[model samples]
Target: KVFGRCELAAAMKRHGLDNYRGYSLGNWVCAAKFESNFNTQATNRNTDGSTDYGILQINSRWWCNDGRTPGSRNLCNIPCSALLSSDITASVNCAKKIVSDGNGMNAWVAWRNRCKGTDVQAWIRGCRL
Candidate 1:
């Protein structure tokens, strides 16, 4: 399901993503926006045959397994399919693992191009959380 902006923001807030690993909730919101546009079923295939799954586009090479990426470690121990669920918990937790791996928020290009070093209040604007 495609989520409304306010709905996504509110859900993310409740999930404890606010200021996670030094990145604010707005950063996550913007990533979800430009990365997958808050579409739960969003998926992308990489040139390396690994896939990006769900709203946060968690990678199959390391975070989750898809049976397509032979190099998968499934470090997060999650099924890539779970990332596509309307339940955003798996997405949030896996993203947390990614940031905790010392990449910070630099792992996502959407955040680099869209969320980095900018005022992100607009992403959560009108969404009282």
Candidate 2:
């Protein structure tokens, strides 16, 4: 399940980010690219071959426990989803929780720096919105 550019764009619009404030969209795109190559359904094992899951490459072993589970899988119903399913917003919210208290897109700063001096294609190769 990959969301195309239009779909991703619409998602950004719905989130009230038309200008990619704080470069949140840029961060999300960069993370997705480096983590999962923009494939929402992507999954893999690390060098040790442990299970890593989903578009954001969230490790189920860490993020999906009784204490970690955020909520349901559906965006309309759940506040977060750790084990129930892989949802993009779930990862976004989790990241937001780590830095911004969900207030703004402070997490995007590093990702944007990674994009510096890189062409759009190369930059987007690791992140795009």
Candidate 3:
């Protein structure tokens, strides 16, 4: 499912991404905007034989088990396919875990380059969270 921008903002907010791990919901919206453009089915194959899946572009190589990546870890303990659901629960949870254990939102290059310390409120401006 491809979400309307503000629709995604509300959804992420409900998922408790707002102020999650010190990053606001706008941070997640901006990350998903650049990585997969709010589309739940988005996928990207990396040059290193890893594949990024779903809205937040969680990679199969380290986060989920796709049964394809050479040294996949399944750190999220889920099938990579789970990230493709419009449900988005797995994607949201995995994303939260990523921020908790890693360099926070730095887990997503899209966040660093597009949202960090910027006026990210634009992503959720029309919505009341």
Candidate 4:
């Protein structure tokens, strides 16, 4: 688990995600807060029988494989467990690919519902990035 917002921002910046793929660092910060509260191991099951993986809550329906989910698109070509690692490199890379596929941060329901159009600057309020 990340200690606080600054740590998360710093890590994201270190990974070159400060302002990536046309989205602001604040957008990612806000999404991560709502999706998983900075917990890399976070996972949740969807009502549709799919599961969300990692901090971004990437869905098994279209991204990674949880093994139990049948006919998953597995677009990231990596196991869901890869996203659960604390390193976050694989998860960030997969998230980047997801955004590149045209969804942007809107692929995450939390981003659309809580972060979009919101004042997200506070997410990185004191961060050097």
Candidate 5:
């Protein structure tokens, strides 16, 4: 599923992520834009032979199971396919767990390379959340 920025912002707010784990909503929104453009089914294979899944691009190596990858730690204890859904609840929960594990938004390279230190207010501009 694809979401408009405003819709996604509201969802994030509902998930208590407006200021989750010390990151601002703008940071999350900005990271999502660069990670998957709000497409739930988005997936990218890393050069390291691991795959990134879903809107946040949660990795198959440590977070979810993609079947093709061996010895997945499954830290999120969820099927990778579960993240590829329009309903973002599972993704949000997993993301929360991921951040709680101490990686924070740094788990997403897109956040580090694109969202960090940027004026992310534009990501939530005009959103009524």
Candidate 6:
């Protein structure tokens, strides 16, 4: 089953996220729901043989270098190194970067609106949390 909103919040807290409610957290939850249903064990095989892993659904190659690393990539969306080095904030900040880089929540807003239907791009134009 996919992880729920509360579960996501808990994981955030475990990783040292405090002010994750309003826009940052709201946006993160939206991304998780849209990306992989918040499933921490979620895994999908890319055509390139790499995999998408964990709750935050980070791509293996982008962060972990190896797609087959299990525990190494299991620390939610942030990298294992980041979490291990006591850089939990870096993980959350990275999440913020992923969502915010697209245009001030445009990607998340689009996902929330049109994810239930088609035309993802059209929805992206005016997406809200």
Provide the global lDDT of candidate 4 against the true structure. Answer: 0.87
Off by over 4 Å in 3: none
| lDDT, candidate 4, at 75 | 86
lDDT of 1 by residue, 17-101 (tens): 9898877888999999999999999999999889999999899999998988986799889889999999999999988889888
Worst 10 residues of 3 by lDDT: 120-129
Q: Which regions of candidate 1 fall more than 4 Å away from where they truly are?
A: none
For each candidate, the alpha-carbon lDDT, in order, equals 0.91, 0.47, 0.91, 0.87, 0.89, 0.48
Q: Candidate 6: misplaced stretches above 4 Å?
A: 13-23, 67-129
- Cα distance off (Å), candidate 1, residue 64: 0.2
Q: After best superposition, candidate 6 residue 120: deviation in angstroms?
A: 16
Give the TM-score ranking, best first: 1, 3, 5, 4, 2, 6
lDDT of 5 by residue, 67-88 (tens): 8786778888889999999988
Q: What local lDDT does model 5 show for residue 74? A: 88
**Sort by lDDT, best first: what order?**
3, 1, 5, 4, 6, 2
- Candidates' RMSD to native: 0.8, 7.0, 0.8, 1.2, 1.1, 8.7
What does candidate 2's lDDT look like per residue over 7-61, in tens digits? 6544544654443435435455555565565566666644543344555555533
Q: How close is candidate 1 to the true structure, as a TM-score?
A: 0.97
Using TM-score as the yardstick, the better of models 2 and 3 is 3
Native-to-model Cα distance after best TM-score fit, residue 27 in candidate 4, in Å? 0.6
Segments in model 5 whose C-alpha atoms lie over 4 Å from true places: none
* lDDT of model 4 at position 61: 86
Query: Which has the better TM-score: candidate 3, or candidate 6?
Result: 3
